[PDB]
């Protein structure tokens, strides 16, 4: 199973790791993608997960959007995990760099509660522009299921652990 994680709470764990490398190693039931409403996996975690699937995630996602239309900010959809996981839970956290309501981050994390265990990034962190310390706090206060957080940046990982209340 998951190794080398620091336990933050009863159900939240954290590790300084590349979520792609973590997913290829563990092959979890669910890997969370930091998705946008259009499932356009261009950069950040989404671009990296999609590149690891040889673009199969994007092809599947475009068919999903053609059929269903875009997701809501704070919403999610379950698609294939391809070579990374059994499933990919595409979750849309608010993108602060697009003026999206940061209060939608709790709604985004509520999607994790439909899955008993997940490998995930911090929602709305990175290129989504939110404060990762705030994202971790919303995660621990919202998610009740077992969440294994992969934080790519070592310096951010150390700051998150050292400042965790």
Ligand X SMILES: CC(=O)NCC1(c2ccccc2)CCOCC1
**Footprint on this chain of ligand X (rule: CB under 6 A):** 113, 116, 144-145
Q: How far is the CB of 2 from ligand X (least distance, A)?
A: 15
Measured from the CB atom, the residue of 55 and 113 that comes closer to ligand X is: 113
Measured from the CB atom, the residue of 33 and 142 that comes closer to ligand X is: 142
Distance from C-alpha of 71 to C-alpha of 99, rounded to nearest angstrom: 17
Measured from the CB atom, the residue of 112 and 152 that comes closer to ligand X is: 112
Q: How far is the CB of 130 from ligand X (least distance, A)?
A: 24
Measured from the CB atom, the residue of 104 and 143 that comes closer to ligand X is: 143
Distance from C-alpha of 96 to C-alpha of 85, rounded to nearest angstrom: 28
Q: How far is the CB of 29 from ligand X (least distance, A)?
A: 13
Q: How far is the CB of 145 from ligand X (least distance, A)?
A: 5
Interior CA angle at 29 toward 135 and 109, to 5°? Answer: 20
Distance from C-alpha of 84 to C-alpha of 141, rounded to nearest angstrom: 27
Distance from C-alpha of 29 to C-alpha of 21, rounded to nearest angstrom: 15
Measured from the CB atom, the residue of 80 and 145 that comes closer to ligand X is: 145
The secondary structure element, H or E, covering residue 133 is helix 132-142
Q: φ and ψ at 105, to 5 degrees? A: -65, -35
Q: Is the dihedral of CA 37, 42, 47, 50 positive or negative?
A: positive
Q: How far is the CB of 143 from ligand X (least distance, A)?
A: 9
């Amino acid at each position: 199973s998951f190794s080398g994680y620091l336990k933050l709470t009863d159900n939240v764990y954290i590790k300084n790791a590349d979520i792609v490398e973590e997913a290829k190693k563990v092959k979890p039931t669910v890997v969370v993608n930091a998705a946008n409403v259009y499932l356009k996996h261009g950069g950040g975690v989404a671009g990296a997960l999609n590149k690891a699937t040889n673009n199969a995630m994007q092809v599947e996602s475009d068919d999903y959007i053609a059929t269903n239309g875009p997701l809501k900010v704070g919403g999610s959809c379950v698609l294939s995990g391809h070579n990374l996981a059994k499933h990919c839970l595409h979750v849309v956290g608010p993108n602060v760099n697009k003026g999206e309501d940061i209060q939608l981050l709790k709604s985004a994390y509520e999607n994790f509660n439909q899955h008993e265990v997940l490998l995930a990034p911090l929602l709305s962190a990175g290129i989504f522009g939110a404060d990762p310390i705030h994202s971790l706090r919303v995660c621990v206060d919202t998610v009740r299921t077992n969440v294994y957080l992969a934080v790519f940046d070592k310096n951010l990982y150390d700051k998150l652990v050292s400042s965790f209340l």
